[PDB]
Amino acid sequence: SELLVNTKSGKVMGTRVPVLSSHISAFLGIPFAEPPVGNMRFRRPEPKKPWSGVWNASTYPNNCQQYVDEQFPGFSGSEMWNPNREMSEDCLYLNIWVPSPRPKSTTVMVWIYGGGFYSGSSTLDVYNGKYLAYTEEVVLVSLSYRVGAFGFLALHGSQEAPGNVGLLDQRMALQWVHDNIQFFGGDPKTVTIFGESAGGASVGMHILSPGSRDLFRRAILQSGSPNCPWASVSVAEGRRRAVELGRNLNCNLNSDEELIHCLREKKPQELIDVEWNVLPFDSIFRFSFVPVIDGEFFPTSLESMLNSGNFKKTQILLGVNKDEGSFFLLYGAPGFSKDSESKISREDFMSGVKLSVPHANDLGLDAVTLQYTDWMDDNNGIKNRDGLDDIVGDHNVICPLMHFVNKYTKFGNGTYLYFFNHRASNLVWPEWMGVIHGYEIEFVFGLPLVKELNYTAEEEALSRRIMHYWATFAKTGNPNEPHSQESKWPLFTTKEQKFIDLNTEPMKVHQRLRVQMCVFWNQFLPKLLNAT
Amino acid sequence: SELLVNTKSGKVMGTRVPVLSSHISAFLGIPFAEPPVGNMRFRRPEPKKPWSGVWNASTYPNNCQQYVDEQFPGFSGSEMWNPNREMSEDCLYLNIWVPSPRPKSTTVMVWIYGGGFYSGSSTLDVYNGKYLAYTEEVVLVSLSYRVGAFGFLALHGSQEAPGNVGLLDQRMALQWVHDNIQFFGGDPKTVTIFGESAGGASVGMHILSPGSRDLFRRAILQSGSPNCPWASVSVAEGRRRAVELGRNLNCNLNSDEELIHCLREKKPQELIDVEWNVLPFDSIFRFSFVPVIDGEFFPTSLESMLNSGNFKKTQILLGVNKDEGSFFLLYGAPGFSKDSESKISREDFMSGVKLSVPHANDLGLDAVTLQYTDWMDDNNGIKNRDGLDDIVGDHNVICPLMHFVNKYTKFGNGTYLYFFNHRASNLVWPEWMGVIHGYEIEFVFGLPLVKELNYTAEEEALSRRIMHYWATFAKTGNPNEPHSQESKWPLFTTKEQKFIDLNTEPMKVHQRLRVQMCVFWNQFLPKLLNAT
Numbered sequence A, B: 001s002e003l004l005v006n007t008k009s010g011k012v013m014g015t016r017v018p019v020l021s022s023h024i025s026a027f028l029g030i031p032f033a034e035p036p037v038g039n040m041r042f043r044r045p046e047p048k049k050p051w052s053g054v055w056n057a058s059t060y061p062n063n064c065q066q067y068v069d070e071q072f073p074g075f076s077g078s079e080m081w082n083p084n085r086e087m088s089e090d091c092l093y094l095n096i097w098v099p100s101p102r103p104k105s106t107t108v109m110v111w112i113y114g115g116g117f118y119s120g121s122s123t124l125d126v127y128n129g130k131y132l133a134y135t136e137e138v139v140l141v142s143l144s145y146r147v148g149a150f151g152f153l154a155l156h157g158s159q160e161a162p163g164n165v166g167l168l169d170q171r172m173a174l175q176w177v178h179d180n181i182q183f184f185g186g187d188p189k190t191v192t193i194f195g196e197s198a199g200g201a202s203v204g205m206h207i208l209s210p211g212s213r214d215l216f217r218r219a220i221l222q223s224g225s226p227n228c229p230w231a232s233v234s235v236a237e238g239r240r241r242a243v244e245l246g247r248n249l250n251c252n253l254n255s256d257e258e259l260i261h262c263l264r265e266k267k268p269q270e271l272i273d274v275e276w277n278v279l280p281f282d283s284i285f286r287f288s289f290v291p292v293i294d295g296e297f298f299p300t301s302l303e304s305m306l307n308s309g310n311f312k313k314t315q316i317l318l319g320v321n322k323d324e325g326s327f328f329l330l331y332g333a334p335g336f337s338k339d340s341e342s343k344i345s346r347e348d349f350m351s352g353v354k355l356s357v358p359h360a361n362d363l364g365l366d367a368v369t370l371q372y373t374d375w376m377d378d379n380n381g382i383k384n385r386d387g388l389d390d391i392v393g394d395h396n397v398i399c400p401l402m403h404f405v406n407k408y409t410k411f412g413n414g415t416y417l418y419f420f421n422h423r424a425s426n427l428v429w430p431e432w433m434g435v436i437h438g439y440e441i442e443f444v445f446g447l448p449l450v451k452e453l454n455y456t457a458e459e460e461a462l463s464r465r466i467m468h469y470w471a472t473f474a475k476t477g478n479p480n481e482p483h484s485q486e487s488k489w490p491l492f493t494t495k496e497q498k499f500i501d502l503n504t505e506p507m508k509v510h511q512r513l514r515v516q517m518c519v520f521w522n523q524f525l526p527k528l529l530n531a532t
Ligand SMILES: ON/C=C1\N=CCN1CCCCCCCN1CC=N/C1=C\NO
Pocket: A067, A069, A078, A079, A081, A082, A118, A272, A275, A276, A327, A328, A331, A437
């Protein structure tokens, strides 16, 4: 049977799914780990014990325990990111979309979801791999991983909660793909890992971590990189935040054993309710429980690893969206609202920059403000709003990514860079937010091919281009067709630093993506803060 | 007789001079001070003892002892600024141009020459007051003052060389104008002092100094203001430089009396030869012997005086030239030449900024470099050259002036601001230097009215406009004609901050002159250097 696959962990029974007037195979909710419940909470993931009989893989699994967005109840813009399945600590499963008829050995793509390491699901509508699997004839896998304290609580030295276990969740799924994707018609030596935001940073972290490298071939990073200021913390800071989480739940704080025991006793939602109380500063774009620089998963500091070329040498395809910051300002910055144009005054701009550059002293805050203020028109609401949008985007996503790409390209075997700046016609968020964080995903997963979702014809065409770029790159290391008549996406080089726009218009090549601002964020401001 | 004038100091005999196919009176080389020779060197100026008989005032006096530019021998561009008369320590004289027939009581304008407090002459061709006196029917006076160590050697505490004596030279000439200009047909209650660069700073210093205020009515400041970083030094720094000058001339340095005695023994040219050896840094736009903040001429620091409104409240007309920095880069910065386009490399740009911001630490130098570099096109020779030109101009002339004007306008009784950006058609300096420091003077003194000097018709028209602005302002406090059909030069206000361009084109009003860069030089960089 086509829906019956025998793996090293046991037999699995899939389901046949309709896709654009055709059909493909779907293997949903396959376990790759033992349930991390009870005393296994905060622990490293253990491999799933093989099962006798046939595993029912016809429906989506549970989503991992996480915070749920309730800011705009009923609004699709915010609820498209919320878990669409029952939540449970028993959530370590993966999903596989397989073309019909089954391939022998074809390109594999593995999706790692974002959500600031505090949220996310593999089961989201925008992550439905059936369109990409069908159109580009790839085997598409979406993994899951523990988020929040459950996945990233870090008490370094302790073996019961060492930190980074969410990253190890991903690794074990990559291990399972390596070991078992052959039986689904996938090529284990041609696996691309790709992810957005926290997933993009995760991808970059698997490039860096020695234990992770051999488990994939190539990498795609969307709106995230490992060196993002929100993507990791020191062991001390991780320790501090875990102790503080215990303080919020009336735990015995005399030792790690006392603390971990207390936290393992608390219901999932008790941890989630007080999670955000441990952040050290009044901030936006910062998350409580994230990867730690532990000396194991990351041997040394990320920067020293990047400088010495201590990482996997392969091809990477990466890029950013035009307005990465808007989503975070709306949710956490004064003066921003969903139903207004959110024209920001100087006072709110100044509040914004503070929230937005938490680790800065007064001189640092003055430097940022000077860098992003038109002092000829400083009371312009639009300019203050867009300037603040640029600050959050540049500091958190673009400039960290630009530093990663420049460092990686020294030692790597091919880099391709994009700038996604098409604003979707059918998008429910207000105009001022622009090309929002995470809204290239729908084009990557081919949602514009579905008429019911109300995209334009040119948006369908863009989606097909992007999908073909992603899948051709996954196959070859090059998003371009070999001898094709279409305009070529040029290689990113240390010298020329070329990149393309990604929109409905004819391709344009530019150079030095946001270099003026990123020299500020990567070279000048760090020098300023270190001196003062 | 029209050329015979009886003053409080004695009788004076002038000369009749041809001016644009007409004639006016000229009283040249009138003494207002006792010769500051011998033991009077470095001393405060004493008033000229009245004389019996008739003083011969038909020829220009001696110029004060100063450095002579020999970089381009024969070249008019550099030698138009050199002394055109025999040099002598006996140089404290003034020159008066009087309309014919003699006026009863008319507007007086008093010119104070520039030259970095180390050079300058009242007798220069570009300072010939006959054109302005004739065309606008004003009494034009040009004073002289001691420059270099002779005028500004400062050993605070000592009464033999107290410092600021060059400023007091100017004051005593203003005193003489106050007391005697009535006999030449000038109105002593309608005297405007005006000057360029060091003369512009001097004018601003007479606005600040309590001892100077009552001696004039209104003020015009050209390409200079009192708060310029090159325009003054502390008492300690002045003391340090005077001791170091003695060290260069093998002086006994055991006391001020020993030092001053030694320096008074040295021939004038011996002081001039080693003058530039006392500068503390490797720099451009810095001069050895300048005004000191002494507690007398300036009661407190200039900034605190400006903030508390401790200055003369009257009308001011002031402004800057487009390319103030070029003259200084040519003479002192690597990569700049008179006979090439002077395209500057990154290495020479970086050398430039160092020379150019002497009192800055490494973080400060990085801030300036970031502020003026297009990081998309950083190897552009033209952009590096023009950027450096802007750095020198902004830091030394425009931003200091913009800080002065903004502070003054709070308490003043009317401000008028200009931006002179017309490049003369007949100008001998290379193209890259643009609208050079000091090259509005010729338009102010009406040289384009003389056909032999080869200006265009539109340059003659501009000159007549500028002269009429200057003279109407001197007369009324307003450069505009009351009920005139010509477009109005708007008042500079704290709120609107309006200014005009000054060129051959129809008048354009702008706002906030170079505010982006001047917020950097006046607000941010000072905060940076004070922290580090
Ligand atoms: O414990 N975990 C989380 C929380 N705890 C208390 C409050 N809450 C904070 C969530 C705010 C994080 C900013 C996220 C807003 N934008 C940006 C990208 N996606 C966003 C919405 N997606 O629905």
